[PDB]
């Protein structure tokens, strides 16, 4: 639970009631904690604990390398494409994206032409 430490973060609200309310608060998205990944980490620990309980109960009683590289590089290329779809693009952002995709498609065409896309090897 992140707690504000300064009056400006606390909206210049005076008193110790607010600090007490913030420290003992519940993680509520409508309230202070929005877009918070802390519930996700709590979910991670819960899943791990359940797995541990199941685990401990009975105890008491060339082509692959090539596909890995191509996946890494095309994944990075899609990583750059992600910010574009997250904006209401203009014409020029659009044409920059078109040049970017043109380069990616040139690499893909090289892959197709050299037979790497075929998995005979």
């Amino acid at each position: 639970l992140y707690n504000a430490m300064t009056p400006a973060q606390r909206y210049f609200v005076e008193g110790e009631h607010v600090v007490q309310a913030e420290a003992n608060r519940d993680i509520l998205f409508t309230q202070l904690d929005s877009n918070s990944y802390l519930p996700v980490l709590h979910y991670v620990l819960v899943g791990t604990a359940l797995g541990v309980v199941f685990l401990v109960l009975p105890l008491l009683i060339v082509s692959f390398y090539i596909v890995s590289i191509m996946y890494l590089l095309f994944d990075i290329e899609v990583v750059y494409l992600i910010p574009y779809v997250m904006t209401n693009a203009t014409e020029y952002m659009y044409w920059v994206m078109q040049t970017f995709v043109a380069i990616l498609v040139g690499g893909f065409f090289y892959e197709w032409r050299m037979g790497a896309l075929e998995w005979r090897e």
């Binding site: 032409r113 050299m114 037979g115 090897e121």
Partner: protein
């Protein structure tokens, strides 16, 4: 043994001399593109495997 060895030698030399011009020039080009294809990192080598005697595409790689 000398007689027989020179018989084999004569067969070889007859084989070389008896080729026609067009075949000789074609064979010169075969030797030349054999030398050019010695580099195995060429793009075309990824495309195909070439027949050794005549550097023609035999099967894809």
């Amino acid at each position: 043994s000398s007689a027989n060895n020179y018989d084999l030698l004569g067969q070889q030399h007859k084989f070389e001399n008896s080729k026609v011009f067009e075949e000789m020039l074609v064979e010169e080009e075969i030797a030349k593109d054999r030398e050019l294809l010695e580099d195995k990192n060429l793009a075309v080598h990824q495309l195909y495997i070439f027949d050794p005697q005549t550097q023609l595409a035999a099967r894809p790689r």
